[PDB]
Amino acid sequence: IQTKEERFNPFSWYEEMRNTAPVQWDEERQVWDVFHYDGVKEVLEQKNIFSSDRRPQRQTALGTSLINIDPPKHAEMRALVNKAFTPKAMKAWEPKIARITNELLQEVEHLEDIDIVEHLSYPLPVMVIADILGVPIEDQRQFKDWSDIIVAGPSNNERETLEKLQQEKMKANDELETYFYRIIEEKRTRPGDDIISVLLQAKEEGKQLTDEEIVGFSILLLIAGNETTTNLISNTIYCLMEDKASFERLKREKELLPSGIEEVLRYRSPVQALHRIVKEDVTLAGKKLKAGEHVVPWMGSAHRDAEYFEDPEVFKIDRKPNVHMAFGRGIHFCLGAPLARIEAKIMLAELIDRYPQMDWSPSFELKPIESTFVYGLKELLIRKNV
């Protein structure tokens, strides 16, 4: 067993491992775990040693996307989309984000008790991402189900359990792919002000990319639009409700909201760990990793490392410095980080401004997402207390 509460609070385990053997082979899971900050940093910076190429027996469109390719192909692909996602590119989206936020809040103005997740932190980012891709938000419910399947972790360690899930992932990949091949066809005919059109335009003009590659990137963004920022927002609310002294201070000092969001990214990171494959034999903190072995750098553990974060187990909305790796580190550093920060800020500032006396509803229950790829809650019932 591990109860819900232990699953959502892995930090005692991380600490134990950090202070004994921060690099260690786990026989059961067949991976090298990496728990200390310097190890996580080294694994993620050393792109030519710790590969992001995840080989399966048929590769997917997702397997050709940015997150799963090594240099020199990675730099070429990322080059085609970088300009579209800079901080300054994304400041253009602020007034859109603020309107979606207000529209969502208006829709539940009549409820005294609301689910932060279902009504606010989940819809806002998929509505943004559907506008960015140029796909219809009327398909939101398919998007969510496909995306939850893809990031889903198994309920047990049994094999008829894992193999059923693998199957359900392959089926979701297929349907996602065929969805986006249709979209592509539609856009070749009727382009729009979206990034699928923009990549088709770059393709017609002779940039080196396949239609499968456009599908793969579109899927990556879709899943990102369903499965990351939602948890940053919800987890922030969770942290502020857990520690009311932080919440009371934030309300007095609004300018601390960005710093507080960075301290959620550290303290309750939406992504706890990543995966790499050893390309060639390497020693990492005195351990000898072999070609072809898998490695799991735990950013969630690194973020609690005392050598880099004074009083690590303490949530400090004003924490400085805060050099966390919640978006990764190195060439695969999250493309969406500017968007995620601005979505989170705008939504959280408005929530806090409207409901300063908010607290857990009598119906609240801790329900962690069953996933190793994402870290968050499935629901978060709050009472407004107006």
Mention every residue, 6+ apart, whose C-beta is less than 8 A from residue 177. Answer: 60, 61, 215, 219
- Bridging pattern class, strands 31-34 and 294-297: parallel
What CA dihedral angle connects 212, 218, 220 and 224, to 10 degrees?
-170
How far is the CA of 229 from the CAs of 86, 87, 93, 94, 226, in angstroms?
Answer: 17, 16, 15, 15, 8
Q: Name the token pair of 19.
A: 């202070």
| 342 near ligand HEM, rule: CB under 6 A | no
**Contact yes or no for 83/110 (Cβ under 8 A):** no
DSSP code of residue 313: T
Q: Which entry of ligand C0R, ligand HEM, none binds 373, CB below 5 to 8 A by partner kind? A: ligand C0R
Q: Which entry of ligand HEM, ligand C0R, none binds 209, CB below 5 to 8 A by partner kind? A: none
Least distance CB 222 / ligand C0R (angstroms):
8
Q: Which residue lies nearer to ligand C0R by CB, 306 or 334?
A: 334
Nearest to 352 by CA among 230, 258, 231: 258
| 104 near ligand HEM, rule: CB under 6 A | no
How far is the CA of 1 from the CAs of 4, 31, 39, 195, in angstroms?
Answer: 10, 21, 29, 44
DSSP code of residue 375: -
Please choose, out of 107-115, 197-205, 220-228, 249-257, the segment that lies near ligand HEM by the rule CB under 6 A.
Answer: 220-228
**Contact yes or no for 219/365 (Cβ under 8 A):** no
Q: Which residue lies nearer to ligand HEM by CB, 183 or 383?
A: 183
**Contact yes or no for 32/296 (Cβ under 8 A):** yes
| 54 near ligand C0R, rule: CB under 6 A | yes
| 340 near ligand HEM, rule: CB under 6 A | yes
| 334 near ligand C0R, rule: CB under 6 A | yes
Q: Which residue lies nearer to ligand HEM by CB, 220 or 278?
A: 220
What is the contact mask toward ligand C0R in residues 272 to 311, using x (rule: CB under 6 A)?
Answer: ----------------------------------------
- Contacting residue, 97, 135, 232, 239, with ligand HEM by CB under 6 A: 232
User: Residue 124, SS3?
Assistant: helix
Q: Is 55 annotated as belonging to a binding site?
A: no
- Contacting residue, 14, 32, 373, 375, with ligand C0R by CB under 6 A: 373
Which residues sit at the interface with ligand HEM, rule CB under 6 A? 52, 66-67, 78, 220-221, 224-225, 228-229, 232, 270-271, 274, 326-328, 332, 334-336, 339-340
- Which residues participate in the annotated binding site? 74, 78, 276, 332, 334
Binding residues for ligand C0R, rule: CB under 6 A, are 54, 62, 150-151, 220, 223-224, 227-228, 271, 334, 336, 373-374
